[PDB]
Design an enzyme around this catalytic site. Structure first.
Site, PDB file in Angstrom:
ATOM      1  N   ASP A   1       0.873  -1.166   0.000  1.00  0.00           N
ATOM      2  CA  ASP A   1       0.000   0.000   0.000  1.00  0.00           C
ATOM      3  C   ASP A   1       0.920   1.229   0.000  1.00  0.00           C
ATOM      4  OD1 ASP A   1      -2.372   1.734   0.446  1.00  0.00           O
ATOM      5  OD2 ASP A   1      -1.540   1.903   2.472  1.00  0.00           O
TER       6      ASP A   1
ATOM      7  N   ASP B   1       0.058   5.279   0.771  1.00  0.00           N
ATOM      8  CA  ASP B   1      -0.122   6.287   1.814  1.00  0.00           C
ATOM      9  C   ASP B   1      -0.142   5.629   3.194  1.00  0.00           C
ATOM     10  OD1 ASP B   1      -0.259   9.031   2.378  1.00  0.00           O
ATOM     11  OD2 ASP B   1      -2.448   9.044   2.465  1.00  0.00           O
TER      12      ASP B   1
HETATM   13 MG   LIG Z   1      -2.562   3.261   3.466  1.00  0.00          MG
END
Ligand SMILES: [Mg+2]
Length: 295
Positions: A25, A27
């Site tokens: 992932d 952010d």
């Molecule tokens: Mg995230």
């Protein structure tokens, strides 16, 4: 089965060693707003050098892939292919392509709740959008899907129009993701696509088909391209209900990083209640702790 063990030492060298690839992932994992997680770029470098594939999975539907890929260089992650990045926007376009129920003569127009980046992704996939210039001399094409994305200009009128299209039971309802909100640099929060999706679902009385994490579709979209083994792949994320659940459904080994949204406390609580789908296999304070596993 997930025990939420802190990954370190001998176990870390075993887990990374046996791993053929890592899904990240973005952010809350690679960076937070304007600030890269220190050591994160170095980790990606060492992964490459060790012959381990790195892929990126994001629920972002705000910027099209070429612009989204810019953030990597901006925040110090050089040498990355655009083909390594998978976003909900990208996968939503591909799913609509695959599933638009119209005849081959006219597959159907898409009514989009979202910005220019998302619309750009959809057009690039050959999708016809409601609101686009009509041919001729010609009527407005029949709308056969509503897509809910991150729409910073969401409005009652757009909500009302979405419902008008969804009056047709054959019209698809799709959402890029269900993230309810996102943290901002100043400590505040911004509404997520999930909150807009909730309104459209409620007003229309329909359930949306969700493209992004924690739905397994983006992984299926990844396997479309590369041949990867979920049993030999790590999924690293900061959000339990999105990233870790995603990893579990895909059969990947999950690693929670603490630099983002979810807290160790929540993970441990889920474990207590026996909700194993929301329990990470491992955790680290930041992904910079994974690097020592490569020696
Ligand atoms: Mg995230």
């Amino acid at each position: 089965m997930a025990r939420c063990e802190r990954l370190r030492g001998a176990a870390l060298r075993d887990v990374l060693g046996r791993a053929q690839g890592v899904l990240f992932d973005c952010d809350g994992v690679l960076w937070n707003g304007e600030r890269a997680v220190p050591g994160a770029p170095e980790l990606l470098e060492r992964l490459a050098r060790a012959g381990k594939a790195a892929l990126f999975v994001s629920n972002n539907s705000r910027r099209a892939r070429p612009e989204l890929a810019l953030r990597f260089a901006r925040l110090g992650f050089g040498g990355l292919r655009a083909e390594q990045l998978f976003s909900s926007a990208l996968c939503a376009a591909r799913l609509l392509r695959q599933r638009l129920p119209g005849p081959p003569d006219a597959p159907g127009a898409v009514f989009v709740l979202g910005g220019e980046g998302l619309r750009a992704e959809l057009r690039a996939a050959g999708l016809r959008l409601a609101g686009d210039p009509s041919a001729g001399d010609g009527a407005a094409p029949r709308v056969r899907a509503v897509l809910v994305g991150y729409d910073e200009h969401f409005s009652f009128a757009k909500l009302r129009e979405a419902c008008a299209h969804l009056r047709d039971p054959e019209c698809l309802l799709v959402a890029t993701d269900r993230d309810p909100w996102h943290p901002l640099s100043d400590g505040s929060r911004t509404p997520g696509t999930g909150s807009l999706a909730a309104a459209v679902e409620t007003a229309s009385g329909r359930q949306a088909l969700v493209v992004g994490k924690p739905s397994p579709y983006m992984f299926e979209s990844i396997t479309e391209n590369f041949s990867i083994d979920p049993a030999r792949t790590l999924m690293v994320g900061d959000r339990l209900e999105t990233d870790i659940l995603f990893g579990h459904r895909c059969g990947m080994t999950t690693v929670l990083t603490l630099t983002g949204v979810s807290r160790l406390e929540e993970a441990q609580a889920y474990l207590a209640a026996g909700q194993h789908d929301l329990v990470p296999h491992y955790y680290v304070e930041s992904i910079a702790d994974l690097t020592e596993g490569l020696e």
